[PDB]
């Protein structure tokens, strides 16, 4: 820590000097950066802040990370441009040009973004987001709102910033955090992207690790928030993504699962349903590897992908007794699927 | 240093630091006696210094009392300026006046302290001018 600490806090404020380090953005901070008159002492106060924070630096802790006041500061700074944004928010919230007015908002989500990352990048920030309006900061709060309301790639953004904030929250404090998610799962789409339901996949991961999160469970089927996304995710259009990235996703809902699979406590339950069908996506996806029968990275990685396949299909075989009643409806795909474990047998060296 | 030079602090005495007051922002204050560049910094080390507020930590009390003198003066050299946030000058007053209470808990004389609570009524006094 100390001097490197702070000269990784200084990477952080460089990250926001460089323009854009948010992708799809011409310029960060600087004219990007910018009452009017009080945001602009705000940013003068974040430029200080980012000084600051470049002569300045257990599980909630995670890695150790750096803590700057003027980072921290920097961060109130970024709430009130963060309120710019959210307020287009709640103009569009008031309304039942302006969307000029979005990408103004958006341009100021991607600057929350990549002040996200500098959160991740420095505690102190992140702390503030921790204590919040007394809890959720009340940007964040109205960030949440505003993600509820491009504008989906910015909430997917916001979806990884809390997935960041969850690993640095506490695990009572990402309680606390969680069940925004549920309201945010309803929030979540097909239609919505499948890159944004990937950070969404990740979120629910961060969220898996919260109590709350954790107390909602795949049973009680639709009901249940965790069977629906399971079931959206069990369709699996991925019509968003494409070739590794929905492979990719469909990863990140298999290290999802892996995590549920770890923890102790993980029809009636739509996920469970939907678990065969995921496994008959898997099975797709497997019948396209036994197809492509590890020279590409993205191939080597699809075959640890399958590998980590197998191994959730068969912890799916012990998690049900009627592991054939799962099985029949996904028969077809399973005489494919023992082909494919043949072949990731014969793969697997 | 202070903290650093303990004996040899005692041995430079309130002096060499008044000194060291005296040729940097004593009195005239104004954008010339504060270096834009220093801005915020130099009154974050002092900060960092009233954040401590070790006045039992410095070998001579005089000493301290200078440094406390120095502190009051800063705050009187202290003006809204570019590069200075009125909320840092008062997260600084803060940790100054969490200083000051330890000093009034255990100081033979109000003293620089008295001054300090001069300046902590400045502002103070602005603010029960407006809110």
Same mark, same amino acid.
């Given at each position: ?199 969404? $996949?990740? +979120? /629910?991961?961060? %969220?898996?690790?919260? @109590?709350? !999160?954790?107390?909602?469970? =795949? ?90 396949? $197998?191994? +959730? /299909?068969?912890? %799916?075989?012990?998690? @049900?007794? !009627?592991?054939?009643?799962? =099985? ?22 | ?131």
């Amino acid at each position: 820590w100390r001097q490197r600490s702070n000269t990784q806090g200084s990477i952080l404020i460089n990250l926001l000097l460089k323009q854009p380090l948010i992708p799809g953005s011409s310029l960060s901070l600087c004219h990007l950066l910018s009452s009017l008159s009080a945001l602009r002492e705000a940013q003068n106060l974040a430029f200080t802040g980012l000084n600051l924070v470049a002569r300045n630096e257990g599980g909630r802790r995670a890695f150790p990370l750096c803590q700057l006041p003027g980072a921290v500061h920097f961060l109130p700074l970024v709430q009130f441009f963060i309120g710019l944004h959210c307020q287009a928010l709640q103009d569009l919230a008031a309304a039942k040009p302006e969307d000029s007015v979005c990408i103004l908002e958006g341009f100021s989500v991607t600057a929350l973004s990549i002040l996200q990352h500098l959160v991740c990048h420095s505690g102190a920030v992140v702390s503030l987001l921790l204590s919040g309006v007394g809890g959720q900061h009340p940007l964040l709060k109205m960030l949440l709102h505003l993600l509820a309301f491009l504008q989906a790639s910015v909430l997917t953004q916001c979806l990884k910033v809390l997935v960041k904030l969850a690993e640095n929250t506490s695990c009572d404090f990402l309680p606390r955090f969680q069940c925004v998610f549920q309201v945010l799962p309803k929030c979540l789409s097909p239609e919505t992207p499948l890159p944004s339901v990937l950070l969404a $996949v990740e +979120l /629910l991961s961060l %969220l898996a690790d919260h @109590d709350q !999160l954790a107390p909602q469970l =795949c049973s009680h089927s639709e009901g249940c928030l965790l069977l629906l996304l399971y079931m959206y995710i069990t369709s699996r259009p991925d019509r968003v993504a494409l070739e590794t990235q929905w492979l990719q996703l469909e990863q990140e809902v298999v290290w999802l699962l892996a995590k549920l699979g770890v923890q102790s406590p993980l029809s009636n339950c739509q996920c469970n349903v939907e678990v065969v069908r995921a496994l008959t996506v898997m099975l797709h996806r497997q019948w396209l590897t036994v197809r492509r029968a590890p020279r590409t990275d993205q191939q080597r990685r699809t075959v640890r992908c399958l590998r980590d396949t $197998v191994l +959730l /299909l068969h912890g %799916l075989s012990q998690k @049900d007794k !009627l592991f054939m009643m799962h =099985c029949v409806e996904v028969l077809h795909q399973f005489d494919q699927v023992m082909p494919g474990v043949s072949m990731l047998i014969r793969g697997l060296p | 240093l202070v903290e650093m030079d303990t004996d040899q602090l005692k041995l430079y005495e309130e002096p060499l630091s008044k000194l060291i007051k005296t040729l940097f922002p004593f009195e005239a204050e104004a954008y010339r006696n504060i270096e834009p560049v220093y801005l915020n910094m130099l009154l974050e080390k002092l900060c960092v210094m009233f954040e401590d507020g070790v006045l039992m930590r410095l070998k001579s009390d005089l000493l301290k009392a200078a440094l406390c003198h120095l502190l009051q003066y800063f705050l009187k050299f202290v003006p809204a300026g570019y590069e200075s946030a009125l909320q840092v000058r008062k997260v600084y007053v803060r940790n100054i006046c969490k200083a000051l209470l330890d000093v009034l808990g255990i100081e033979v004389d109000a003293e620089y302290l008295l001054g300090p609570l001069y300046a902590a009524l400045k502002m103070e006094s602005m603010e029960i001018i407006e809110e």
